[PDB]
Amino acid sequence: SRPLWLPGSTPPAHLKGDLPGDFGFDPLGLGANAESLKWFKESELVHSRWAMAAVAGILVQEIVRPDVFWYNAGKEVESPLGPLGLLAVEFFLMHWVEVRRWQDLRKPGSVDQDPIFSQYKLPPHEVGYPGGVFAPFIPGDLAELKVKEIKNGRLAMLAFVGFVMAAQVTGKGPIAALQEHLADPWGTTIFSKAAVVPGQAVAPPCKIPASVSYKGIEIPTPCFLQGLWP
């Protein structure tokens, strides 16, 4: 039937294949509950879209501005709009849009009306896929496009995790670390930096310092779960 993550596996009973991207991977049974599955579905959608934009941004950044480091690109911008005014505008606008999305989650058909201008509203849609002003120019079918979206999004989530850990253990960017891997495949993999043996543990050092100043304070910038590193 449908392509599963394990070709010979029987999928969990709650995973019947109705969702976009239901490749039968719920070994812990987190989506066994019908009500929490919807929240986890929306969470996957927004994690997917955030990670896709994030990976595209890091890639484009390391293309067109390679002198800056994306792990360091918070303290190497120095906008004139202040470090606090940035946080203020983003906090308020994101609180707005995210509470609107949350009210879409709680009450599905509730928040479609443009509050300021009374004549625009979104059509009745699904939970997680607004459409309307969000979605002009759909190039093809909707279910296949949702499948493609969630697949590229899962790949982008794993890609951002790889970005983070490779920026931590190497201190280089994604494309820079890729050029390092292509410059020495057998000698720059995580297997070639680390090894734990019953008697010896070799964890790679992270090139990210423990703290960065950023204007008179000490921002703690720790490597993710060092110590648990191999």
């Binding site: 297997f191 070639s192 930096k193 070799v202």
Partner: protein, 227 residues
């Protein structure tokens, strides 16, 4: 199941000659439940085939280059000329990925027999399965199958048991004496009354550890005596 492993014994109820090389031995009663019997037969086949490859590699490497100790051949300073002093981490990574794939596919053959018989990229060519553990097809390209299948299976598994015994013999002879298999045979034919398992048990030529590119592998023996 005819001509059992011993004259005065009886075959177990779960071994009736249905599988190849069944002499009805099972003195520890491990193949009593059939799923465990399937798993143990698969692991038998794996241990057998890998041990046949093992003795083949040791013997062939010892005949074509006796100057390389097979016990220390895994070290990068003893690797051949294109791979000498290679980074063992990337090698382990290559092996890890390439074997995780095929062994997970084999495990899925065990769990769902007849589900991973298909090439998951080029969706036209499948491998048949007479039984589990004997794929055939691209794994049997010379076409020795579609004949006396049970007979070849008995030959395979018997040479495989023998190869298991023989490779652990190689390992023990290498740990006790410090020489290869045919090296040990020539050394026994050099002195068959003073150079044997007598006065070699109690000595382990294996060091307590090695340094392979910075690590420290514990490097044990199969028995104590003389470090």
């Amino acid at each position: 199941d005819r001509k059992l492993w011993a004259p005065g014994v009886v075959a177990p109820e779960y071994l009736k000659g249905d599988l190849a090389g069944d002499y009805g031995w099972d003195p520890l009663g491990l193949g009593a439940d059939p799923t465990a019997l399937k798993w143990y037969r698969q692991s038998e086949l794996q241990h057998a085939r890998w041990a046949m490859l093992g003795v083949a590699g040791v013997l062939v490497q010892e005949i074509v280059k006796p100057d390389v100790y097979f016990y220390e051949a895994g070290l990068p300073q003893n690797l051949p000329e294109p791979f000498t002093n290679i980074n063992m981490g990337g090698l382990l990574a290559w092996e890890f990925i390439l074997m995780h794939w095929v062994e997970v596919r084999r495990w899925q053959d065990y769990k769902n027999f007849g589900s991973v018989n298909e090439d998951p990229i080029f969706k036209g060519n499948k491998v048949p399965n007479p039984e589990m553990g004997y794929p055939g097809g691209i794994f049997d390209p010379f076409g020795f199958s579609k004949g006396n299948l049970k007979e070849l299976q008995t030959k395979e598994i018997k040479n495989g048991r023998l190869a298991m015994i023989a490779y652990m013999a190689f390992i023990l002879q290498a740990q006790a004496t410090g020489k290869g298999p045919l090296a040990a045979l020539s050394a026994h034919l050099s002195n068959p009354f003073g150079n044997n398992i007598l006065k070699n048990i109690g000595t382990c030529t294996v060091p307590h550890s090695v340094d392979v590119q910075g690590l420290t592998i514990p490097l044990t023996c199969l028995w104590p005596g003389s470090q």
